[PDB]
RNA sequence: GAGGGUGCUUGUACACCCAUAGGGUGAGGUUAAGAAUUACACUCACUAAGUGUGAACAACACAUACAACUUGUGGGAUAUACGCU
């Protein structure tokens, strides 16, 4: 059978379900080193994952051994003592063990040794840099570790443990969009995949993947909308007779010029603020806009393709075209306004998994 | 409003006999300032009518060099047009006198 | 008046407040000067923000409308402000 679900993530609110201050800074100060021991983590085994296959290399420079990754008691030219992830997994556990759990590495291990393979071509070659971690990663956790999920109705709130921590989920006013998605799981009905948690200065965050499935509407193949992005437009769609204007000029690209240009504003004002205290204080207000337009982009964006796929499903459009959009990537290519101010990857990414989980098929010409 | 899918009134002209419509007056000068007022008023409340009616097949098409063709704005429209014009409706409004009428300095 | 805090996350606005927050400071290194003292886009860090209960800078309860809510990680690339020639 196919894969009748599309991979979905939410973001949840958890308070450290304790009662005193001291308790609940112990284990907010626990989790932070959690985090800088993941992202000690996540370089270990990116160097350990890179250092071998140049030994490859050197020895076939050598005598052009086939020297290959496997296991020497499984293979005669295997040179590793046992599985390369294993060998990731150890050579981290080893020094990090004691003070954060094992289920992040395995899992950071997976989601590192997963993609290097395929950046292999990019590597022997040479057009790709060892990633270089952040320390404000989002560390990762499996299924593995979800544990004493319940609803304690006293607090109003769902009740878990994160690998023996005790937490209160503030959903607050969201009493039916993922209320009834945490209780899809606390009765076993709902998949949940290996998650992530960001910790964002007092506030906590779960990014859960819950894997949410397709919806079927009544749709009509033969029925095609005629879609096209642009500036000045950003959703233009045609249904026969149907048009609808999705996006304006000013609600997308003024107001995003707008938030840069005050950014620029802040920037050139940062230089004669408050000095001799640090750089950091200087560009403190700098710091306000971190993702201030990207925000607002990734919001109007969402909220453009939502008008999309709920124009073409209710028209019953069941293949959505977008027209001349590779020509229209080719221009934009060449040029600097078009690409550093129309996000079309994000829009065209955004309808393909709107789209692919309406059922609704997306051309691209 | 009076039921415009009955009415009496003729379509077009007709040759009306004076005799009858000045009548009550005694005056046809009269009677005419008489029924092209009750015309006005009754030209006012069709045009509110037809816009009411018009509101509901408001197709929202941004477009406006192309021309669209709305078959039921169109039935409407065309409802309303072989009605017997308003000036038409107040003559038979007031031939079977059903148009009030008072003079405001004579009744002072 | 911008910008913000609480009102799950995002956007708009909204009530209540904070807001010279593009500020008020503390420490370490360094520099200059006879000294007071100044200096650093040098480094690190602290400090403001709904109502009630509550001795309380403890904790708990309550707190607006619409729309959206698949993210995270990394690489390549460009540009902005600043510093030097």
New binding site residues.
Partial sequence: MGKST??????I?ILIDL???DE?KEVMDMMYQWRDRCFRAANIIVTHLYVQEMIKDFFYLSEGIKYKLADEKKDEKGILQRSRMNTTYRVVSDRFKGEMPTNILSTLNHGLIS?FNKNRVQYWKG????????K???FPFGLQGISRLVYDEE??AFCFRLYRVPFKT?????FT??RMLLERLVKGDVKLCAS?I?LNG??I?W?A?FEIEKEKHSLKPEVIAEASLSLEYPIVVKTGKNRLTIGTKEEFLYRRLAIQAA???????????????????????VD?YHK?ES??V??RI??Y??KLI?FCIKHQAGTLILMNQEDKVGIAKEE?FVL?NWSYYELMT?IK??AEKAGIELIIG | MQDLKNTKAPVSTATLNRNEFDSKTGNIYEAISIASKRAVQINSDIKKELLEKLEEFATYSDSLEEVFENKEQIEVSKFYEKLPKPHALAVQEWLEDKIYYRNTEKDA
């Fill in positions: 599309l991979k979905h993530t939410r973001k609110q009662p005193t201050k609940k993609s057009e790709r840099s060892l990633p270089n971690f952040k404000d990663m989002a607090k109003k503030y959903l607050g006013k969201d969009d993922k992530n960001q007092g506030k965050f990014l993947v950014r620029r504003r802040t920037q050139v004002g940062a230089t004669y603020s408050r000095s001799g205290k640090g750089k950091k204080r200087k560009l403190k207000a306000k201030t925000n607002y990734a919001h969402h909220v393709s939502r709920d600097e550093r955004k998994y709107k």
